[PDB]
């Protein structure tokens, strides 16, 4: 959404993909042990990547909606299913007038690779409805998200075993609660797992802890996994830890709000927030809760008391971490050289262009790629789907057993020691640390979503770092991610 | 029975609901953050509350049977589903002549509120067939069970993801076995979950441990949690603990007997048991096992040696704990004044009417409401359903692994204690407690049923107790319960 | 093919089953509660058994294939399903020219009793296709197994909850991956468990760790569980353990190879390998990894540098353990007199005829029977089917949480101890041993596969031993197995 650096979104991801695929093409051919080796392996690798790139299924919908004034409006909509190498497909629904089959094809291709980076067992899919939800009433929105769902279900583009959606820009809990309900009510009344047909749902309708803040929490973790690796902080020329540093977020939505929230909590200082109508600034810090508070009461952030209204690209604030948490293609050729930050935390899906990437590369700015950084969402989504399939709130059946097993464990160590040091020690009590006391009943659902997220973010950071160093990609972390993703997906097509 | 206090079962439970519905009314109202405020909320609340109360679907059957002698007899039956706010619906099949669409309706609703109290994710449901089983041969009872399953199946009132029935009065393992068999042999031949279609099954047919005795056991756990609470035991004027307590039991069925078994087990003296033809009595104690033996032997509890035949309402026996475990509407305004017991443990479904509830409160008899006490049934039926869904005996895959790990964990405390106390300590064997040795391979199925039930019946007892004290219901435990059932259900309907 | 002791495979297996039944007939009768005592107790038992013996269903197939050369070829095939007392049926697919309806029938019956022995909740089934796989192309072997999958799909002889096939002779990962796909391509396109329709799948395609290796790994465990019971090695006249031991293996396929791997890993010297074009032999040891490389490089074992072409029945090689791991009816009345080994571990399916079983009995030769010994297969098959159902890799969500739990757990022992022993201890570190360090995150998938298998095999080993002694069967391990399989399947037969 720019001027003279606005590449076709799908091809822009194909561009990233194609790059990380030459980095491994040698590795893939060497891997494949096919008896007809040769270039008849080089090419059967060439064939396989050629099948991965294009979305397998796209469905373009035109369906009518009775507006609230009575009039009829033909509402446009698409869901692309990138890959089935794992079913079901996974990916959000976006309500925007930028929605096009190519944008939605791209977000789709971005989603399989996002799930490969964090080893989430879904092929990618994405959906968009070409509307601007500020122009519609809640009742209209409901009328839309439901009719969109009925069309998806009858053509096989939603369903717990075939394709599971999620939230995105201008969608969220509410519209997730609608989709779930119209599918379960119609196409899947007999389907035991009907409410696993979409993620992002309200806690009470089958959703999971922290799903709303999930993408932003995972954003904090991806940054932490690098903000603390001195290997890179050296190459950057700045010091480890969050306690030093300063950041600005583009976008105050589910991603941005929660990206701010957590970075602030662990010490970092938010100097600048912006949305589609302006940006505010104050190097002394902006408290996410006051900002949020103000945002909720005023429909905008502009004119926040404890900050100035910043004239100028927030992308170009003076800060250490810039977090694009709005939409795509916001860091482009023309404005990359003015970025002033050292780290670009890609909250959003593909907010930086290939050619901004190259500016950042040689300008020694670390772009942490969307592929990995915003996969907090699908992770905690996958957890939500898994919650649905399992039909049990994590911990429920085992809390009392482990609280029990653990005192009996602890009591074993007590008794053993008292058996030996009869009265020299006397009564050796063996009791939980405050922190083991919290852990003592086993993981709760909240427990699993935080730790399982961390585990994923730290592990997928690692195999990005291990892969970045194995190929000397330096700060080009993006293509390192597409290397692991291309790697894993090819494996499925391979065997 | 009772002819002057025979309220229509559905409206009666509707009453209990409404009551609890009022005390939350201000709470629910202030919770919901709807922007359109003031009293558009208060309507919203009794608007949602007005959808909860009525049953969504009720299915009336008339189907023919060929009796043994060769005649044709027509059997009528019903199944009511009260909610789908949780899929599937859960609820028993009862075979009595009292069955009417209405009692099946009230029973179903009761099941919805029940599962809410007890955090089981099922909407309530219930069936009934208008036969006295006693009057049919085993072969006939089979035909009736099967054809009634086919009717429920075709019209979609049974199925693992729609509606999982279960036992009730005059049905047990045997019948569920036939239900599960004709379902899975016809409609379910393809369902990987065909045997999750019903619960209460023979363990050999998909059942779970202790599902027969599970509602009895949950009765005990429910009584215990209060009887061991000094706050209520002061108010009630009785000693904490089961040691000094005497109790009587109306009904000697699945929940009748096993309630006796577990209460007798932990120290309570069962002085009297009743059935549909009379009661027996002995304030020196009746042993469940001897009584069970005699009953299976002579089809009647009457004429049991070690206890006299008690002339009169066993409900009115002198005792600590009165446990209705028969049909509904047995403690009424007629006989509520002269009950004698200080704790009513509603093992049966809706056994004390609201008129009695009133007397009991200002008499300061404590009523543990069926809502919370007999949920030990679904809770294990929920476990059985979960067992079927997972297709593994709990523990099977982890027994050895957990056995080994605890051993190496224990070993690490040892090798570390010796690493410090070189030889003044010597060799310090760290060994499992006899009880941690039982708990060393991890929880078996049995362990999950026992412990999961215990956790459940207490976690729910606490938030009942907490809600009694927050709204000063004192001993109106039922009203706190519905207050919690409502609060949890309402949360679904609006969010 | 033995020209004087070739019983019809099905009847032969019926004999083993008959044998065991008359042993527990008195047992089944006495347990049977039945009011109708007497011998109408005996006759229901024998009627039920009369139901268990015959296969419930057999599908015979004729379907044409157009060969690579463009000619038309009528491929015959079979699937028999023997029991549904557990759904789905389980059992391998076999490609051979021996595949007859009677052979397929026998193998399927062998599956139901096999899973009964190892407590794998599957009725048994088996399919063959009457082809020499050596005589067809990869392309032709795909058209065949794909069309066979379609024939099996459309008549209900494959489906994740109806009948889950798996590998067997001349089938493997590559065929399973086709079955799985062909099924999930078509019929199962909406099935959330389409990929659980078959086991043996590649790991990237829903397979499980070590399932190729699973069966012989259980052959190892099953031998191990017997080779270490002094009671049985006494009777035998051999030393406990693998230390000094020596074995020959008929068959070098998926059972033969890994049986030979694992036995070799834990001591034993493999002295003969054999296939269908001959045997090799070397008393001083055949290293399995060597023989694999040579096999893989030469498509045969004959002329393996480190052994001599053995001439003469591999079944009569001098060794401690003879392992038939090929086809059935290898050890027959003609050559059983000449077998020389003391433990016959039946990794194959039905390798030993009944007349040869008799000879082995009175020769004091312990045949560890197929029924139990090669059930490592289904068990790990079971594990993968569950893997597919649970849609999560084992441990994924709990690793990080368990790590921190154990560290705080130990940290609790540390600080508790330091609180007592102020400075007379000083700093009392408590750390994981090396072994508990490996388990400190919880069980990985392979962890479960390895310990789950081992658990299953030791437990099943025991209940066979337990049965043998109680029935004074001594070395008739087979009848002990059938006696458990009959016991277990019966008792499901309750209405
Ligand atoms: N769970 C999720 O929702 C996940 C989201 N993502 C990605 O992160 C991005 C944001 O998602 P989310 O934050 O949920 O969407 P939301 O709609 O919830 O929040 C959107 C934010 O972006 C701002 N914004 C949009 N366009 C611009 C612009 N051109 N210039 C400045 N600010 C702008 C909006 O401001 P205004 O309100 O003024 O338009 C708002 O602050 C998307 O690209 C999404 O794909 C990644 C992973 C998961
Ligand atoms: N899982 C369950 O079974 C659950 C059951 N409940 C409730 O428990 C109650 C009993 O269930 P269950 O015990 O399974 O039924 P059963 O058929 O198992 O046995 C019921 C017993 O109650 C007796 N009885 C019935 N009505 C009367 C009466 N009016 N006066 C005296 N005795 C009577 C019967 O006597 P006879 O045999 O002589 O008729 C029989 O002995 C039911 O109301 C059920 O809804 C609640 C939660 C779970
Ligand atoms: N999961 C499994 O695979 C399980 C298999 N089994 C049983 O084990 C046996 C084979 O399993 P699998 O290893 O999969 O079969 P494979 O297809 O893997 O080949 C087995 C081996 O047997 C050899 N062989 C075949 N026929 C003869 C013969 N007449 N004389 C000598 N050697 C012969 C083959 O050599 P050639 O190539 O020359 O035929 C090959 O080395 C069957 O009985 C099967 O049912 C038991 C449990 C599970
Ligand atoms: N937008 C917003 N979300 C919040 C706020 N406080 C908590 N949350 C989110 O609400 C969900 C539940 O929060 P909590 O109940 O406080 O528990 P939590 O897991 O500690 O959540 P976190 O505070 O993010 O770590 C989490 O997703 C939180 O991120 C808030 O002030 N604003
Ligand atoms: N009718 C009857 N049931 C019993 C008896 N003993 C146990 N049960 C129930 O039958 C099932 C099998 O009993 P057990 O295998 O001993 O299991 P358990 O959990 O240790 O038994 P309990 O703790 O007494 O419930 C359990 O659900 C018991 O509750 C009995 O003597 N009579
Ligand atoms: N056919 C064959 N299988 C092998 C060979 N080496 C290992 N495997 C099997 O392939 C699987 C993958 O091996 P690993 O990742 O090393 O796992 P593992 O659990 O340590 O396997 P084990 O060596 O049997 O203990 C396991 O089932 C191995 O048994 C081999 O040389 N040939
Ligand atoms: N749409 C979000 C999350 C998708 C999901 O939760 O499935 C993303 O870009 O990753
Ligand atoms: N009908 C039983 C519960 C049966 C079940 O769903 O398992 C009750 O009223 O609580
Ligand atoms: N043919 C194999 C089947 C194993 C499986 O089901 O994977 C056996 O005899 O056990
Ligand atoms: Zn349409
Ligand atoms: Zn959280
Ligand atoms: Zn009908
Ligand atoms: Zn029990
Ligand atoms: Zn056909
Ligand atoms: Zn392994």
**Is residue C431 classed exposed, middle or buried when 0-12, 13-18 and 19+ CB atoms within 10 A define those classes?**
middle
Output the six-digit token pair for B336: 């509520």
Å from C423 to nearest chain A CA?
13
List Cβ neighbours of C54 (8 Å cut-off, separation of 6 or more).
Answer: C82
Element spanning B343, H or E: strand B343-345
Task: Compute the C-alpha angle B282/B285/B288, nearest 5°.
Answer: 110
Instruction: Indicate the resolution in Å.
Output: 3.0
Neighbours of B494 (CB within 10 A): 16
DSSP notation for A337-367: GG---SEEE--SSS-B-HHHHHHHHHTT-EE
Using CA atoms, how far apart are residues A20 and B393, in angstroms rounded to an integer?
A: 45
Output the six-digit token pair for B365: 């008899």
Using CA atoms, how far apart are residues B90 and B80, in angstroms rounded to an integer?
A: 10
Of A87, A193, A495, the CB nearest to C177: A495
Using CA atoms, how far apart are residues B331 and C17, in angstroms rounded to an integer?
A: 58
Chain-centre distance for alpha carbon C234: 27
Instruction: Answer whether B401 sits within 8 Å of C425, measured CB to CB.
Output: no
List Cβ neighbours of C326 (8 Å cut-off, separation of 6 or more).
Answer: C169, C250, C251, C253, C256, C275, C276, C348, C351
Element spanning A153, H or E: helix A138-154
> Is residue C193 within 8 Å of C201, Cβ to Cβ?
no
Using CA atoms, how far apart are residues B301 and C413, in angstroms rounded to an integer?
A: 55
Output the six-digit token pair for A375: 């996969």
DSSP notation for A432-460: --HHHHHHTT---HHHHHHHHHHHHHHHH
> Is residue C428 within 8 Å of C189, Cβ to Cβ?
no
Q: Is the dihedral of CA B87, B92, B96, B98 positive or negative?
A: negative
Closest residue in B to C161 (Cα–Cα): B192
> Is residue A31 within 8 Å of A493, Cβ to Cβ?
no
Output the six-digit token pair for B481: 């319960």
Phi, psi (rounded to 5 degrees) for B115: -60, -25
Using CA atoms, how far apart are residues A318 and A338, in angstroms rounded to an integer?
A: 10
List Cβ neighbours of C316 (8 Å cut-off, separation of 6 or more).
Answer: C335, C338, C339, C340
Dihedral angle of Cα A373, A376, A378, A380, to the nearest 10 degrees: 170
Using CA atoms, how far apart are residues A275 and A314, in angstroms rounded to an integer?
A: 9
> Among residues B70, B117, B97, which one has the least CA distance to residue B169?
B97
DSSP notation for C135-160: GS-TTHHHHHHHHHHHHHHHTTS-BT
Q: What is the greatest pairwise CA distance in chain C?
A: 90
Question: How far, in Å, from the CA of B87 to the mean position of ligand 8?
Answer: 15
Please list every residue in chain C whose beta carbon sits closer than 8 Å to the beta carbon of residue A454.
400
Using CA atoms, how far apart are residues A181 and A184, in angstroms rounded to an integer?
A: 5
Neighbours of C185 (CB within 10 A): 15
Buried b (16+ CB within 10 A) or exposed e, A153-174: beeebbbbbbbbbbbbbbbbbb
> Is residue A273 within 8 Å of A315, Cβ to Cβ?
no
Using CA atoms, how far apart are residues B160 and B152, in angstroms rounded to an integer?
A: 13
Residues of B labelled as active-site residues = 126
Using CA atoms, how far apart are residues C88 and C444, in angstroms rounded to an integer?
A: 27
List Cβ neighbours of A246 (8 Å cut-off, separation of 6 or more).
Answer: A268, A269, A271, A283, A318, A319, A320, A321
> Among residues B194, B185, B190, B95, which one has the least CA distance to residue B145?
B95
Give residue limits of the domains in chain A: 1-56, 57-205, 206-495
Output the six-digit token pair for A365: 């700015």
- Cα distances (Å, whole numbers) of residue A15 to A24, A25, A129, A455, C110: 15, 15, 25, 29, 56
Instruction: Answer whether C410 sits within 8 Å of B413, measured CB to CB.
Output: yes
> Is residue C222 within 8 Å of C345, Cβ to Cβ?
yes
> Among residues B88, B217, B109, B268, which one has the least CA distance to residue B162?
B88
Neighbours of C26 (CB within 10 A): 11
DSSP notation for A206-260: T--TTSTTHHHHHHHHHHHHHHT-HHHHHHHTS-SSSTT-EEEEE--SHHHHHHH
Using CA atoms, how far apart are residues B319 and B270, in angstroms rounded to an integer?
A: 9
**SS3 state of residue C44:** helix
Using CA atoms, how far apart are residues B219 and B213, in angstroms rounded to an integer?
A: 10
Cis-peptide, bond into residue A88, ω within 30° of zero: yes
> Among residues C367, C353, C340, which one has the least CA distance to residue C477?
C367
Q: Determine whether domain C57-205 maps to CATH 3.40.50.10860.
A: yes
Please identify among residues 182-241 of chain C the ones whose CB lies closer than 8 Å to any CB of chain A. 184, 189-195, 202-205
Chain-centre distance for alpha carbon C100: 21
Using CA atoms, how far apart are residues C386 and C389, in angstroms rounded to an integer?
A: 5
Using CA atoms, how far apart are residues A457 and A455, in angstroms rounded to an integer?
A: 6
- Cα distances (Å, whole numbers) of residue B10 to B15, B83, B110: 8, 14, 9
Q: What is the greatest pairwise CA distance in chain A?
A: 89
> Among residues B124, B132, B84, which one has the least CA distance to residue B327?
B132
Report whether residue C348 contacts ligand 3, using a CB cutoff of 6 Å.
yes
Report whether residue B289 contacts ligand 5, using a CB cutoff of 6 Å.
yes
Report whether residue A378 contacts ligand 7, using a CB cutoff of 6 Å.
yes
Task: Compute the C-alpha angle C442/C446/C449, nearest 5°.
Answer: 105
List Cβ neighbours of C262 (8 Å cut-off, separation of 6 or more).
Answer: C216, C217, C219, C220
Using CA atoms, how far apart are residues C291 and A311, in angstroms rounded to an integer?
A: 75
Chains near C, with 3+ CB pairs < 8 A? Answer: A, B
DSSP conformation class of C268: P
How far separated are the first and last CA of chain A, in Å rounded? 40
Output the six-digit token pair for B304: 């049991």
- Long-range contacts from B72-76, C-beta under 8 angstroms, 24+ separation: B75/B129, B75/B130, B75/B131, B75/B144, B75/B147, B75/B148, B76/B129, B76/B130
Using CA atoms, how far apart are residues B436 and A307, in angstroms rounded to an integer?
A: 59
Question: How far, in Å, from the CA of B484 to the mean position of ligand 12?
Answer: 39
Using CA atoms, how far apart are residues C255 and C263, in angstroms rounded to an integer?
A: 12
Element spanning B434, H or E: helix B434-438
Output the six-digit token pair for A414: 């007590």
Report the helix count and the strand count for chain A, using DSSP H and E.
Answer: 16, 13
Instruction: Answer whether A439 sits within 8 Å of C405, measured CB to CB.
Output: yes
Class of domain B206-495: alpha beta
> Is residue B421 within 8 Å of B428, Cβ to Cβ?
yes
Please name the CATH architecture into which domain A1-56 falls. Orthogonal Bundle (1.10)
- Cα distances (Å, whole numbers) of residue B199 to A391, A464, B91, B133, C484: 16, 48, 9, 20, 27
B79 DSSP β-pair partners: B59, B127
Element spanning C62, H or E: strand C57-66
Using CA atoms, how far apart are residues A51 and A57, in angstroms rounded to an integer?
A: 12
A345 DSSP β-pair partners: A368
Element spanning B384, H or E: helix B376-390
- Cα distances (Å, whole numbers) of residue C334 to A72, C161, C310, C318: 87, 43, 20, 17
> Is residue A77 within 8 Å of A96, Cβ to Cβ?
no
Using CA atoms, how far apart are residues C236 and C341, in angstroms rounded to an integer?
A: 11
Report whether residue C376 contacts ligand 9, using a CB cutoff of 6 Å.
no
Buried b (16+ CB within 10 A) or exposed e, B279-290: bbbbeeebbbee
Asked if the domains C1-56 and C206-495 are classified in one and the same CATH topology, the answer is no
> Is residue A227 within 8 Å of A241, Cβ to Cβ?
yes
Using CA atoms, how far apart are residues A386 and A90, in angstroms rounded to an integer?
A: 13
**A19 annotated as ligand-binding:** no
Tokens 């250490």 found at: A320
Q: Is residue C430 within 8 angstroms of chain B, CB to CB? A: yes
Å from A194 to nearest chain C CA?
11
Of C195, C391, C400, the CB nearest to A386: C391
Using CA atoms, how far apart are residues A311 and A98, in angstroms rounded to an integer?
A: 25
**Is residue A234 classed exposed, middle or buried when 0-12, 13-18 and 19+ CB atoms within 10 A define those classes?**
exposed
- Cα distances (Å, whole numbers) of residue B441 to A401, B402, B406, C455: 12, 5, 8, 11
Of B194, B202, B204, the CB nearest to C87: B194
> Is residue B121 within 8 Å of B110, Cβ to Cβ?
no
Å from B294 to nearest chain C CA?
16
């Amino acid at each position: 959404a720019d001027r003279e650096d606005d590449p076709n979104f799908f091809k822009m991801v194909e561009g990233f993909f194609d790059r990380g695929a030459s980095i491994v093409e040698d590795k893939l051919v060497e891997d494949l042990k096919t008896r007809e080796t040769e270039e008849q392996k080089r090419n059967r690798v060439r064939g396989i990547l050629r099948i991965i790139k294009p979305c397998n299924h796209v469905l373009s919908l035109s369906f009518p909606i009775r507006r609230d004034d009575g009039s009829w409006e033909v509402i446009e909509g698409y869901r692309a299913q990138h890959s089935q190498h794992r079913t079901p497909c996974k990916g959000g629904i976006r309500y925007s007038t930028d929605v096009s089959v190519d944008e939605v094809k791209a977000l789709a291709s971005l989603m399989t690779y996002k799930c490969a980076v964090v080893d989430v067992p879904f092929g990618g899919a994405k959906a968009g409805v070409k509307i601007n939800p500020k122009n519609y009433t809640d009742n209209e929105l409901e009328k839309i998200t439901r009719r969109f769902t009925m069309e998806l279900a009858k053509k096989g583009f939603i369903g717990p075993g075939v394709d599971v959606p999620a939230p995105d820009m201008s969608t969220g809990e509410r519209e997730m609660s609608w989709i779930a309900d119209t599918y379960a009510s119609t196409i899947g009344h007999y389907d035991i797992n009907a409410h696993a047909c979409v993620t992002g749902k309200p806690i009470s309708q089958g959703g999971i802890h922290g799903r709303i803040s999930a993408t932003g929490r995972g954003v904090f973790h991806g940054i932490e996994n690098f903000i603390n690796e001195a290997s890179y902080m050296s190459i950057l020329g700045m010091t480890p830890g969050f306690g030093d540093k300063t950041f600005a977020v583009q976008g105050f939505g589910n991603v941005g709000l929660h990206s701010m929230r957590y970075l602030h909590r662990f010490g970092a200082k938010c100097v600048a927030v912006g949305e589609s109508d302006g940006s505010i600034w104050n190097p002394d810090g902006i408290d996410p809760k006051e900002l949020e508070d103000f945002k909720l009461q005023h429909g905008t952030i502009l004119g926040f008391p404890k900050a100035k209204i910043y004239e100028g690209s927030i992308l170009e604030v003076d800060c250490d971490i810039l977090i694009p948490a709005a939409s795509e293609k916001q860091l482009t050729k023309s404005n990359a050289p003015r970025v002033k930050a050292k780290i670009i935390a890609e909250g959003a899906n593909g907010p930086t262009t290939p050619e901004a990437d190259k500016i950042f590369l040689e300008r020694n700015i670390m772009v942490i790629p969307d592929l990995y950084l915003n996969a907090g969402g699908v992770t905690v989504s996958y957890f939500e789907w898994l919650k649905n399939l399992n039909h049990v709130s994590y911990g429920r059946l085992t809390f009392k057993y482990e609280r029990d097993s653990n005192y009996h464990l602890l009591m074993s160590v007590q008794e053993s020691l008292e058996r030996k040091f009869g009265k020299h020690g006397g009564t050796i009590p063996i009791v939980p640390t405050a922190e083991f006391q919290d852990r003592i009943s086993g993981a709760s659902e909240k427990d699993i979503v935080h730790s399982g997220l961390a585990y994923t973010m730290e592990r997928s950071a690692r195999q990005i770092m291990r892969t970045a160093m194995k190929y000397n990609l330096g700060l080009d972390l993006r293509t390192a991610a597409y290397v692991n993703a291309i790697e894993k997906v090819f494996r499925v097509y391979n065997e």
